[PDB]
Amino acid sequence: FRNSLHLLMETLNATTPHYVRCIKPNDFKFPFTFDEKRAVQQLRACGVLETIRISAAGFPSRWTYQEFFSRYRVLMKQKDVLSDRKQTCKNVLEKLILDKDKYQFGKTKIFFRAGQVAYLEKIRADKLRAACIRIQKTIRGWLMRKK
Amino acid sequence: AEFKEAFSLFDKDGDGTITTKELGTVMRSLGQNPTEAELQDMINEVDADGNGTIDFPEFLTMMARKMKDTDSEEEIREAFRVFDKDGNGYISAAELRHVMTNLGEKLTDEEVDEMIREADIDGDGQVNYEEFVQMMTAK
Amino acid sequence: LHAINARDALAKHIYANLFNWIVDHVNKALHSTVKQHSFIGVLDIYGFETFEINSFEQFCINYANEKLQQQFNMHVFKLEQEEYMKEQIPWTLIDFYDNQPCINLIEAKMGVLDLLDEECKMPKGSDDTWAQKLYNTHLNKCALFEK
Amino acid sequence: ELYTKYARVWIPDPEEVWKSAELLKDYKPGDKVLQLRLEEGKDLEYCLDPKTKELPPLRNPDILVGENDLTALSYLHEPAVLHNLKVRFIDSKLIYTYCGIVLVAINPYEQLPIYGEDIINAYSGQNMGDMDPHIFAVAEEAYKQMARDERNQSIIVSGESGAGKTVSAKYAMRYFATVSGSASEANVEEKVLASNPIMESIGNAKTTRNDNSSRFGKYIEIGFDKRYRIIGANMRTYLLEK
């Protein structure tokens, strides 16, 4: 078995390899039916979840400067917007996510650590969240002086 | 903005001290519009840890220490959103209630229901938020 | 017992050669008279096989999968370096997860297959003595081996 | 921090493996429990294990859910992968998804009109990233890198028995046959496909968990001339259960 296994690896290391992982989603041959218990078992014994576990260590989330700018134009202060849109994204991100190990700036993309784009969507929520406090405080001083 | 007369309208008892929990209303009876957060931070940065009440001297020292932050809470005269991106000038009553009661330092629904009394609502279900902000503050 | 092991060895030998012979002659219907330049091969192969009772057959399947997953891990690592270079990011920010110590526990000298092959030329060996030899050699001297 | 009210998590379930929940109150550090809501409405307290003090895995925001690659997801962990593949398969009938350089193929059991001549022409000559994930896209990339580098290629198809590995190989071969200036009497696909009942008889068997299971590796090498055209094929066998 060891000898046949080496001979196979030699044949496959003379080539460039392409990868398809096939998954059975249910046990009873049912058209377009997913069983979560079957699917999770299939993914673990296929290396998929472990490969994904490795990928999340580095910088898996990759956005272009155009995509980042479109969703996050609201998070900017109006005067931190520049004629260059790539440089604008550089300035904004380094005042929204403070730790600078959390992302790297390429030629045409931004490379983000795991959970970081989720944090950007959280501070997009938190900004609307913190906007209210500002209005509410003004109303509650107005109404108290009237009282 | 200290005022002994205003303190004396909140010292009811004539004891000389007011409850520590009436600190946010005394600041907002003087003038100042502070957050409930800023008010808690101001109390927490003094070892008024076990203090049940505050005298006028204590309240004076806190306002002097925090004068800059508290004064910034009567500069504003206008108020933008960040709701509305279309720039319609309108916001749904649903979004307006959500920003008031879900977000930040959360008003009660009963306070929001008070603020939307008399406030016009169209057939889309939207309110002019510029008129609504002017009607709450100007009044 | 030695006669029975030899009978089975002969039955297994004849089948392996008959299996090869059919493949050679199936190839003669699929061969071309035109000279080849290059090829694309398609490998149809299993994944990790885990049942509730796992034996030698499963051990061999999972051993082959560890060799394949190692080539995959190396191939992904090279491609990440090429993508990192295209964007001009520091290429020393990719951690490689080696699986060679697992492959070595299986196939090196004093490994699981080697100690099995040793016990199999002993005239009084057993599965029980092999199991104790595995514990004496590996248990608490390696962290990929438990009892 | 991140576990605020109205943020959503996955909790274990015996029926669906992982079920969706939403935080009724904000998590306060050193709390023992979370307050949640389920697929009826607003019921459970969720205990936290006291030796680890760990927290249940977060749900991605909906703007990143449905995507053609799994690496796009910000919270990349077991229920995120499972949920993302489920919605593409059930809601949209999409059986192919990437995972970086890996194509995931989920067996539909049904027969789909995504394997005809028109679809083959649409993938023909395109880049892998610029088209929807398909077994055809993987085949095109192999044909392309072959002449780009002067280098023979290996498509490695893996998975449990019955997951569709044999079907995936059948469509990769039809792509290579159609795109390459077809041989007349050879029609190589047909001869190779007729070799399957022979190989299945001597190489496959019934096991405790499968009716038909291959107990070997089968490598079919598709041979090309110096004008890049299908001319023949070669079978190699490895790893037989003696």
Side-chain angles (χ1 to χ4, degrees), chain A residues 15 18 24 36-37 42, chain D residues 15 86 151 154 156 160:
Chain A
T15 55
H18 316 274
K24 142 168 55 118
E36 293 70 26
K37 282 90 49 164
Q42 296 285 291
Chain D
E15 322 262 75
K86 177 168 175 157
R151 187 163 175 83
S154 293
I156 300 181
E160 199 177 298

Side-chain angles (χ1 to χ4, degrees), chain A residues 68 72 75 91-98 119-120 123:
Chain A
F68 182 90
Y72 298 115
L75 278 64
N91 302 315
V92 170
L93 188 55
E94 305 171 318
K95 280 174 277 188
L96 265 48
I97 307 185
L98 304 173
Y119 179 68
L120 294 170
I123 58 183

